[PDB]
Design a protein around this nucleic acid. Structure first.
Ligand SMILES: [Mg+2]
Ligand SMILES: [Mg+2]
Ligand SMILES: [Mg+2]
Ligand SMILES: [Mg+2]
Ligand SMILES: [Mg+2]
Ligand SMILES: [Mg+2]
Ligand SMILES: [Mg+2]
Ligand SMILES: [Mg+2]
Ligand SMILES: [Mg+2]
Ligand SMILES: [Mg+2]
Ligand SMILES: [Mg+2]
Ligand SMILES: [Mg+2]
Ligand SMILES: [Mg+2]
Ligand SMILES: [Mg+2]
Ligand SMILES: [Mg+2]
Ligand SMILES: [Mg+2]
Ligand SMILES: [Mg+2]
Ligand SMILES: [Mg+2]
Ligand SMILES: [Mg+2]
Ligand SMILES: [Mg+2]
Ligand SMILES: [Mg+2]
Ligand SMILES: [Mg+2]
Ligand SMILES: [Mg+2]
Ligand SMILES: [Mg+2]
Ligand SMILES: [Mg+2]
Ligand SMILES: [Mg+2]
Ligand SMILES: [Mg+2]
Ligand SMILES: [Mg+2]
Ligand SMILES: [Mg+2]
Ligand SMILES: [Mg+2]
Ligand SMILES: [Mg+2]
Ligand SMILES: [Mg+2]
Ligand SMILES: [Mg+2]
Ligand SMILES: [Mg+2]
Ligand SMILES: [Mg+2]
Ligand SMILES: [Mg+2]
Ligand SMILES: [Mg+2]
Ligand SMILES: [Mg+2]
Ligand SMILES: [Mg+2]
Ligand SMILES: [Mg+2]
Ligand SMILES: [Mg+2]
Ligand SMILES: [Mg+2]
Ligand SMILES: [Mg+2]
Ligand SMILES: [Mg+2]
Ligand SMILES: [Mg+2]
Ligand SMILES: [Mg+2]
Ligand SMILES: [Mg+2]
Ligand SMILES: [Mg+2]
Ligand SMILES: [Mg+2]
Ligand SMILES: [Mg+2]
Ligand SMILES: [Mg+2]
Ligand SMILES: [Mg+2]
Ligand SMILES: [Mg+2]
Ligand SMILES: [Mg+2]
Ligand SMILES: [Mg+2]
Ligand SMILES: [Mg+2]
Ligand SMILES: [Mg+2]
Ligand SMILES: [Mg+2]
Ligand SMILES: [Mg+2]
Ligand SMILES: [Mg+2]
Ligand SMILES: [Mg+2]
Ligand SMILES: [Mg+2]
Ligand SMILES: [Mg+2]
Ligand SMILES: [Mg+2]
Ligand SMILES: [Mg+2]
Ligand SMILES: [Mg+2]
Ligand SMILES: [Mg+2]
Ligand SMILES: [Mg+2]
Ligand SMILES: [Mg+2]
Ligand SMILES: [Mg+2]
Ligand SMILES: [Mg+2]
Ligand SMILES: [Mg+2]
Ligand SMILES: [Mg+2]
Ligand SMILES: [Mg+2]
Ligand SMILES: [Mg+2]
Ligand SMILES: [Mg+2]
Ligand SMILES: [Mg+2]
Ligand SMILES: [Mg+2]
Ligand SMILES: [Mg+2]
Ligand SMILES: [Mg+2]
Ligand SMILES: [Mg+2]
Ligand SMILES: [Mg+2]
Ligand SMILES: [Mg+2]
Ligand SMILES: [Mg+2]
Ligand SMILES: [Mg+2]
Ligand SMILES: [Mg+2]
Ligand SMILES: [Mg+2]
Ligand SMILES: [Mg+2]
Ligand SMILES: [Mg+2]
Ligand SMILES: [Mg+2]
Ligand SMILES: [Mg+2]
Ligand SMILES: [Mg+2]
Ligand SMILES: [Mg+2]
Ligand SMILES: [Mg+2]
Ligand SMILES: [Mg+2]
Ligand SMILES: [Mg+2]
Ligand SMILES: [Mg+2]
Ligand SMILES: [Mg+2]
Ligand SMILES: [Mg+2]
Ligand SMILES: [Mg+2]
Ligand SMILES: [Mg+2]
Ligand SMILES: [Mg+2]
Ligand SMILES: [Mg+2]
Ligand SMILES: [Mg+2]
Ligand SMILES: [Mg+2]
Ligand SMILES: [Mg+2]
Ligand SMILES: [Mg+2]
Ligand SMILES: [Mg+2]
Ligand SMILES: [Mg+2]
Ligand SMILES: [Mg+2]
Ligand SMILES: [Mg+2]
Ligand SMILES: [Mg+2]
Ligand SMILES: [Mg+2]
Ligand SMILES: [Mg+2]
Ligand SMILES: [Mg+2]
Ligand SMILES: [Mg+2]
Ligand SMILES: [Mg+2]
Ligand SMILES: [Mg+2]
Ligand SMILES: [Mg+2]
Ligand SMILES: [Mg+2]
Ligand SMILES: [Mg+2]
Ligand SMILES: [Mg+2]
Ligand SMILES: [Mg+2]
Ligand SMILES: [Mg+2]
Ligand SMILES: [Mg+2]
Ligand SMILES: [Mg+2]
Lengths: 72, 119, 185, 212
RNA sequence: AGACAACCUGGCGAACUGAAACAUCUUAGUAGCCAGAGGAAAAGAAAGCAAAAGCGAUUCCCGUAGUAGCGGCGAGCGAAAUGGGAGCAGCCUAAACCGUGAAAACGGGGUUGUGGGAGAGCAAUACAAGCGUCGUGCUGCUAGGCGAAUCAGUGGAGUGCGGAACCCUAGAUGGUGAAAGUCCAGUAGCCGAAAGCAUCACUAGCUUAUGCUCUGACCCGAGUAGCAUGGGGCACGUGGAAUCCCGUGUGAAUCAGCAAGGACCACCUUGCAAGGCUAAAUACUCCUGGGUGACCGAUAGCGAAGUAGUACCGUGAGGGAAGGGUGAAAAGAACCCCCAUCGGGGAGUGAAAAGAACAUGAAACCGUAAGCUCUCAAGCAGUGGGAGGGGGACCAGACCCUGACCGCGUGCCUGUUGAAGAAUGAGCCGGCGACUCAUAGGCAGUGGCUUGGUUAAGGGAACCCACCGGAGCCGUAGCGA
RNA sequence: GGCCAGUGAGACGAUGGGGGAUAAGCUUCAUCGUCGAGAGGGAAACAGCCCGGAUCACCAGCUAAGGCCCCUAAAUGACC
RNA sequence: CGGUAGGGGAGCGUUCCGUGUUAGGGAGAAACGCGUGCGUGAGCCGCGUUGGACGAAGCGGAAGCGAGAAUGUCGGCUUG
């Protein structure tokens, strides 16, 4: 009984991984106030986007058991 | 495994102290001061090994100017040197200074060659 | 060229000597140690949380939770051990041989762990099998059993464990079958 | 095999020849594999017994300036600390375990490479076990000197059996190690000047570690 | 009855802290305090898990797993079943009924769950198994004993050195004027207990015991379960909130029952609450006996190698130091001289005076002697040039010490847009004094296998370690809530 | 792309401007240089101006910016 | 081939362990003091009209492993 790293749970309900090993997320803002957002915008906010390279650190740091390829 | 520092320090200190022998006052005594004083010494040394190369050319030139000025009324260092070059002689300033002191007659001759040829 | 305790030594590069910070400048990271000047990151003690940016609403908090997870809809889980035909080709199977589950542990092309142990087997078509094999599994993909019955292999489909049903629902589901049967006949 | 082995009877004449053929580490990494194996061995042997007291173990704190001077431990107005004499020890040793791991196959490889380096020394023997009945040290040493072992240089007897008479008869020489396969270490092989096997032993070793 | 280090059980039960504030949450049911018992305690013999296939009291380790989940869905918290091991053990009682009484009690009977027992009849009987005064037994512990093998030379001393020998079931260890298998005490090996203790066997004795058939009417742990409310605890924060345990109030059913299977109802499966008791595997060190130490060596190691919980300080709770190493042996210096003692100088002891404030004895700091040199001088004290003077040389043209006079030269650190700063810090010297360890994640470098790789706990001639131990784990399929 | 840092108080100078009084060694931006983190020379001394970017030795030589009465290196040079 | 924050490479030393009950050592070890010795440096190698019993090199391993700053800290000793 040592200590093993804990997965940061609030980060894992947000991000996940695709089979080839890139991280993805939802897009923000499709929840309420949709009437005044045009359909085109709503479609754009419906899809799954690969997380910006920049944040990869923070994310990766808080989800140590996520299997991830950064493509090396 | 506990390790006392032992002599590793005192040797270093001692080998510094050897350096600082014959410094007046507490520069030859206390370790902490001695350190600094070592560094400064080493530093001046380095500096003045460069100054040295400047200062002897200072000197040499001065002595040469003195040595020549005796002959002509109108003769200089500047004139001299310019004349040494347009006559194609290689002698540098150390040699002309040491020959100015230690073999004066020689310099008189040299001057007589430069004069004869500029004539 | 004989080994003794004294001629031994490591491989170049193997054990690289570690930075000891805080010793000397000329060495390495002396004084500050490579923490630069001051403020939080140079201070001793636990840092700030990994996912946290300055008090701006952190990235993970400003993004909405993933689809099913978000409410407590159970996560999707593998229910079979998928095998292609590739693997069964590469393996040493001579004709007539039974494949099943067990004989795939035998040759090792599947190493099951706990969750996987408790599972059944399913076959996925990929690659083109040349042999006649006797295959046993709880399930097949369409392309699978198509390619299999095309190559002349016998496909034994194993029964799954009966779902217990109370009698009333048997009466309903049977009443159905009686309807179909009286209608076609 | 690229080299024979002498098989000697109890009197020291050469009866026969054998071959001991094993998995060797490929010639470049040999040294390092053995090395590693060794390091591992010694390092697991170690018992970290070194213990200190941290700043919180040390007897007799109270949190205050000291009221009066304890000669050598403090002065009148000072704060309690690690920086006194008789203060806690910052980053001292605590009892450890030093135990590291290594692959089984790697281990075995070190063993083989060592024993296969030892083929420039080693003899074989005709299994003397019976000739000793009452434990006799003097006798064992006699036998050694007939085989050409100086009871100086540290030699290793690897055999299958411990026959009590043999075992006790060798118990008191500091340079001998009588090994069963039960106890066989990389350490002792590396250490030993002369290697000595029985026939049954060669049959064992050449099987366990045999190259295919 | 009191005492008792840690461990343990029960009762009360915080706060700083984390959440970059804080209030739910965290810290943590931790510390502390009270009470209690043991060498372990507690838990424990399914009103249990599970899922349509099965298990078979409790505890502990590995793993599942940082998975399912919980959460101002924030900080964080965090299971279980399957699977592998360690270790194994199951028993007493209430009620129906039959005896004795007016009772309340006592004696027999009776204890189980894919139901048992009471009731009513007919068969079997001898072995088996469990407990245990008394006692020579076995072993061990608490005193012990026997125990192999060497000499001379070498400058205080020989165990060292050179040179000869020998023992070894003994070459562990400590001592000895100096390092020893062979000098001493010992070690291997082998013998030994009147008395007490302990584990084991046996030990009269004490215990128990089967088998079938009929009978739903008799029993199967009541102010209980449940229900309504108020909480607590379960990984699970009231949530759809099961299971578990408590305040207030109501309040069942007996096997044709009752409970559990994560609201609830049906169906099936599993189990039998409201009475008890029980060994081992596990935790710990005020200690006892052995062992080892990439542990300390007098500022270290325990606070304590000497009066150490002392001196001293505090009304009191409490705080809490320092002082080790003459020599092998005191052989601790007779006698004379200075002489009131101390102290000294000879002599004598000693390998050495090492001379008692005595072993190596650095620096600061205090001096003494010899070489050069300063009293018209301005300077972070040096440095490049070197007048004059002095010293030990062998490459005598060199080295070393001094320093007439010229030039150059704004202490160190920290920290700053920037410092000689009149910015901080250091009296000086010597010691002590800081990126450490454990466990995981990622990356790199090296190896090992790639007939994919690897074992965890666990076992090991004590450790290490051969050889096991495939449970797990990583890689072989993705997409999708 | 990977691994893994500091930095996130700047100063003046040239130039374009705003605020201010076309005040400030003021303040705030824009395009540059030096200092920061740069020693050497010129500037009496003199972070930010000019020259130039210091691997090291030499009792060698040529120059830049700048200078040639004496302190103090070089012309008490020439001609208007 | 200037260099602060800072990153990377190559090394030296200290105590201990392996080799090792090692080589060497009352024909004087550690240490202490010295050098016209060798290193880019940390340092090494040599020497002792000190000292009185231990202990290298090589090839490896481990850390209570290098001090001038902490109004650090304990002793010693100054200044006034
Ligand atoms: Mg995948
Ligand atoms: Mg919606
Ligand atoms: Mg980063
Ligand atoms: Mg030590
Ligand atoms: Mg230290
Ligand atoms: Mg001088
Ligand atoms: Mg490290
Ligand atoms: Mg480095
Ligand atoms: Mg510093
Ligand atoms: Mg850093
Ligand atoms: Mg700082
Ligand atoms: Mg910073
Ligand atoms: Mg902090
Ligand atoms: Mg945290
Ligand atoms: Mg939502
Ligand atoms: Mg999925
Ligand atoms: Mg797998
Ligand atoms: Mg304390
Ligand atoms: Mg201490
Ligand atoms: Mg009591
Ligand atoms: Mg009491
Ligand atoms: Mg007790
Ligand atoms: Mg709070
Ligand atoms: Mg608070
Ligand atoms: Mg903390
Ligand atoms: Mg807080
Ligand atoms: Mg805070
Ligand atoms: Mg026990
Ligand atoms: Mg109990
Ligand atoms: Mg049972
Ligand atoms: Mg029961
Ligand atoms: Mg289990
Ligand atoms: Mg078992
Ligand atoms: Mg059982
Ligand atoms: Mg009974
Ligand atoms: Mg049933
Ligand atoms: Mg029934
Ligand atoms: Mg009956
Ligand atoms: Mg005896
Ligand atoms: Mg004897
Ligand atoms: Mg002798
Ligand atoms: Mg001898
Ligand atoms: Mg003696
Ligand atoms: Mg001895
Ligand atoms: Mg004995
Ligand atoms: Mg019944
Ligand atoms: Mg109730
Ligand atoms: Mg309700
Ligand atoms: Mg209720
Ligand atoms: Mg609750
Ligand atoms: Mg609840
Ligand atoms: Mg229950
Ligand atoms: Mg359950
Ligand atoms: Mg219930
Ligand atoms: Mg309760
Ligand atoms: Mg009832
Ligand atoms: Mg049940
Ligand atoms: Mg019951
Ligand atoms: Mg209950
Ligand atoms: Mg019960
Ligand atoms: Mg109990
Ligand atoms: Mg002392
Ligand atoms: Mg002490
Ligand atoms: Mg001492
Ligand atoms: Mg006297
Ligand atoms: Mg008197
Ligand atoms: Mg006297
Ligand atoms: Mg005398
Ligand atoms: Mg004498
Ligand atoms: Mg002394
Ligand atoms: Mg005057
Ligand atoms: Mg004068
Ligand atoms: Mg003066
Ligand atoms: Mg001067
Ligand atoms: Mg000046
Ligand atoms: Mg000046
Ligand atoms: Mg300021
Ligand atoms: Mg100052
Ligand atoms: Mg400042
Ligand atoms: Mg300031
Ligand atoms: Mg200080
Ligand atoms: Mg001050
Ligand atoms: Mg340190
Ligand atoms: Mg850190
Ligand atoms: Mg670590
Ligand atoms: Mg790691
Ligand atoms: Mg590899
Ligand atoms: Mg193991
Ligand atoms: Mg064990
Ligand atoms: Mg073990
Ligand atoms: Mg900002
Ligand atoms: Mg700012
Ligand atoms: Mg700052
Ligand atoms: Mg400006
Ligand atoms: Mg401007
Ligand atoms: Mg304009
Ligand atoms: Mg104007
Ligand atoms: Mg303006
Ligand atoms: Mg300004
Ligand atoms: Mg310009
Ligand atoms: Mg700066
Ligand atoms: Mg620059
Ligand atoms: Mg400049
Ligand atoms: Mg200047
Ligand atoms: Mg420039
Ligand atoms: Mg250049
Ligand atoms: Mg010129
Ligand atoms: Mg001039
Ligand atoms: Mg003029
Ligand atoms: Mg350059
Ligand atoms: Mg550089
Ligand atoms: Mg740097
Ligand atoms: Mg060394
Ligand atoms: Mg050493
Ligand atoms: Mg020796
Ligand atoms: Mg010596
Ligand atoms: Mg030593
Ligand atoms: Mg040396
Ligand atoms: Mg060396
Ligand atoms: Mg001695
Ligand atoms: Mg060595
Ligand atoms: Mg040394
Ligand atoms: Mg330390
Ligand atoms: Mg100091
Ligand atoms: Mg002060
Ligand atoms: Mg002091």
């Amino acid at each position: 009984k040592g200590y093993k790293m804990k997965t940061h749970k609030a980060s894992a309900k947000r991000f996940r991984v695709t089979g080839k090993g890139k991280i993805v997320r939802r897009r923000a803002g499709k929840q309420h106030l949709l009437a005044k957002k045009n359909t085109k915008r709503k479609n754009r906010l419906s899809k799954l986007i690969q997380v910006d390279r920049s944040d990869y650190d923070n994310v990766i740091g808080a989800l140590p058991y996520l299997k991830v390829n950064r493509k090396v | 495994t506990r390790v006392k520092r032992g002599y590793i320090a005192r040797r270093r200190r001692k080998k510094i102290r050897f350096f600082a022998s014959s410094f007046r006052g507490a520069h030859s005594r206390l370790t902490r001061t001695i350190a600094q004083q070592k560094i400064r010494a080493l530093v001046s040394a380095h500096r003045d090994r460069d100054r040295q190369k400047r200062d002897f050319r200072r000197l040499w030139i001065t002595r040469i100017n003195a040595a020549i000025r005796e002959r002509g009324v109108y003769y200089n260092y500047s004139k001299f040197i310019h004349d040494l070059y347009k006559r194609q002689l290689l002698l540098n300033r150390k040699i002309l200074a040491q020959i100015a002191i230690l073999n004066p007659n020689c310099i008189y001759m040299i001057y007589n060659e430069i004069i004869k040829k500029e004539d | 060229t004989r080994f003794r305790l004294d001629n031994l030594g490591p491989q170049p590069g193997s054990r690289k000597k570690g930075k000891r910070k805080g010793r000397g400048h000329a060495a390495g990271q002396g004084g500050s140690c490579g923490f630069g000047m001051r403020g939080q990151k140079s201070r001793s003690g636990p840092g700030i949380m990994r996912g946290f940016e300055g008090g701006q609403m952190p990235l993970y908090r400003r993004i909405p939770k993933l689809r099913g997870i978000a409410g407590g809809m159970r996560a999707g889980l593998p229910k079979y051990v998928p095998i292609n035909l590739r693997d069964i080709e590469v393996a040493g199977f001579k004709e007539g041989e039974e494949v099943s589950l067990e004989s795939l542990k035998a040759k090792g092309i599947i190493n099951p762990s706990g969750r996987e142990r408790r599972l059944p087997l399913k076959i996925l078509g990929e690659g083109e099998l040349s042999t006649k094999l006797q295959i046993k599994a709880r399930a097949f993909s369409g392309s699978a059993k198509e390619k299999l019955e095309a190559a002349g292999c016998s496909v034994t489909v194993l029964p799954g464990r009966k779902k217990y049903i109370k009698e009333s629902v048997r009466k309903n589901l049977a009443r159905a079958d009686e309807y179909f049967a009286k209608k076609r006949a | 095999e690229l080299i024979p082995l002498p098989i000697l009877n109890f009197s020291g004449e050469k009866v026969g020849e054998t071959f001991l053929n094993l998995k060797t580490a490929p010639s470049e990494t040999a040294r390092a594999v053995v090395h590693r194996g060794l390091i591992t061995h010694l390092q697991n042997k170690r018992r970290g017994t070194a213990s200190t007291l941290t700043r919180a173990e040390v007897r007799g704190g109270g949190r205050k300036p000291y009221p009066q001077k304890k000669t050598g431990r403090a002065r009148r107005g000072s704060q309690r600390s690690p920086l006194r004499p008789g203060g806690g020890v910052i980053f001292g040793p605590k009892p450890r375990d030093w135990t590291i791991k290594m692959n089984k196959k790697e281990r075995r490889l070190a063993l083989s490479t060592a024993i296969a380096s030892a083929v420039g020394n080693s003899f074989v023997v005709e299994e003397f076990a019976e000739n000793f009945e009452k434990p006799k040290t003097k006798d064992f040493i006699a036998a050694m000197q007939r085989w050409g072992l100086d009871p100086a240089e540290k030699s290793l007897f690897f055999l299958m059996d411990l026959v009590e008479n043999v075992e006790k008869s060798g118990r008191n020489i500091r340079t001998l190690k009588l090994l069963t396969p039960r106890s066989l270490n990389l350490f002792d092989v590396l250490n030993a000047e002369k290697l000595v096997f029985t026939e049954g032993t060669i049959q064992y070793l050449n099987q366990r570690y045999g190259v295919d």
